[PDB]
Design a protein around this ligand. Sequence first.
Ligand SMILES: O=CN(O)[C@@H](CCc1ncc(F)cn1)CS(=O)(=O)N1CCN(c2ncc(OCC(F)(F)F)cn2)CC1
Ligand SMILES: O=CN(O)[C@@H](CCc1ncc(F)cn1)CS(=O)(=O)N1CCN(c2ncc(OCC(F)(F)F)cn2)CC1
Ligand SMILES: [Ca+2]
Ligand SMILES: [Ca+2]
Ligand SMILES: [Ca+2]
Ligand SMILES: [Ca+2]
Ligand code: NA
Ligand code: NA
Ligand SMILES: [Zn+2]
Ligand SMILES: [Zn+2]
Ligand SMILES: [Zn+2]
Ligand SMILES: [Zn+2]
Lengths: 165, 166
Amino acid sequence: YNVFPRTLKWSKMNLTYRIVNYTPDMTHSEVEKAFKKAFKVWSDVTPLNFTRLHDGIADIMISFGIKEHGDFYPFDGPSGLLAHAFPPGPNYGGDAHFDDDETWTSSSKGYNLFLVAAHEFGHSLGLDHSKDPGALMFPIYTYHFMLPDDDVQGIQSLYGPGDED
Amino acid sequence: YNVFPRTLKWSKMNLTYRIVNYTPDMTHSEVEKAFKKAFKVWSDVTPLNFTRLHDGIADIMISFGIKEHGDFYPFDGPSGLLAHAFPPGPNYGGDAHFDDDETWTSSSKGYNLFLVAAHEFGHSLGLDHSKDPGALMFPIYTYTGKSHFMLPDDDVQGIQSLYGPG
Ligand SMILES: O=CN(O)[C@@H](CCc1ncc(F)cn1)CS(=O)(=O)N1CCN(c2ncc(OCC(F)(F)F)cn2)CC1
Ligand SMILES: O=CN(O)[C@@H](CCc1ncc(F)cn1)CS(=O)(=O)N1CCN(c2ncc(OCC(F)(F)F)cn2)CC1
Ligand SMILES: [Ca+2]
Ligand SMILES: [Ca+2]
Ligand SMILES: [Ca+2]
Ligand SMILES: [Ca+2]
Ligand code: NA
Ligand code: NA
Ligand SMILES: [Zn+2]
Ligand SMILES: [Zn+2]
Ligand SMILES: [Zn+2]
Ligand SMILES: [Zn+2]
């Protein structure tokens, strides 16, 4: 027999993502680089592996959308809700959606896609918000990056550290 | 930090259920009897008790639906996905949905509702799929043709690991 796990977490280390569509605001390459770096934040401190699929069904489906976009969390135009992502699970679980009524950037202007994506992917992997104001998973955005201790502790609580050196 | 913690089991032994709507394929009485028997599979081997509510919110809300039916886990027409149920927890937790593009039956012409429901309610109570090929919670539907059903030992052991014996 098997009972359910104690926390929402992926029951496998090999995860896939797919960039289903792209923002007007940045080039394809910039978007791909930001998402790759954002996944690496998490793979660097766990045993998780992330592989990009160009089509088909990936664990973490990533998309840019506005207003109603096919779930219970419609976007709301400029500002306000910026993005959201679902906890680990089937179907919409793990998926990450970015409001394309925001301005996404590879800079300090607008909202930095890498930083927001890293936080989203924390949700995708099973972290909720943190009360540590210095954490990546703190619920409020403020603009090299090094994953804060609180987030390391949280993600390792789910998946272990992988190779520690 | 915070994670998303799962409710590993119901923290009360007395649970309610509600049959929200009914399949075309069976009479109301047949549906009621199938679900009552499916809950009895589990209450017979634990301290869990199940009571039916006719109105309002119940712990285990049961419904029949097709395609996209309100939870963004859509059904898929005949065959494939037959039903799904959510683990213990508030709101949709415990609830069970049956794909009404299947043919549900009290016997063998289609999918026996009692058998599938008993499996669903395993999920509702905190059991995932078993690897024991003879288990109720082993995820392949089969039909013995026998008039009596005995809960396999793997499932007894699994549910008692959560709730203890009767
Ligand atoms: O994730 C998304 N939200 O929290 C939504 C709420 C929807 C939701 N809630 C819970 C859940 F599990 C899933 N979705 C609110 S928001 O305004 O769109 N949100 C604010 C916080 N954001 C952020 N990003 C980077 C960052 O780096 C901090 C650092 F720079 F220090 F690293 C700090 N916050 C991202 C965008
Ligand atoms: O429960 C539902 N599913 O598993 C869905 C997947 C959605 C899902 N996955 C996990 C979870 F926790 C919740 N929901 C798949 S399915 O094809 O619809 N399906 C349901 C009925 N299954 C079955 N197996 C044996 C049996 O008696 C076996 C016996 F006769 F030997 F006793 C009676 N039903 C076969 C598998
Ligand atoms: Ca997914
Ligand atoms: Ca917005
Ligand atoms: Ca419920
Ligand atoms: Ca189906
Ligand atoms: Na935009
Ligand atoms: Na039907
Ligand atoms: Zn969305
Ligand atoms: Zn967040
Ligand atoms: Zn459903
Ligand atoms: Zn199942």
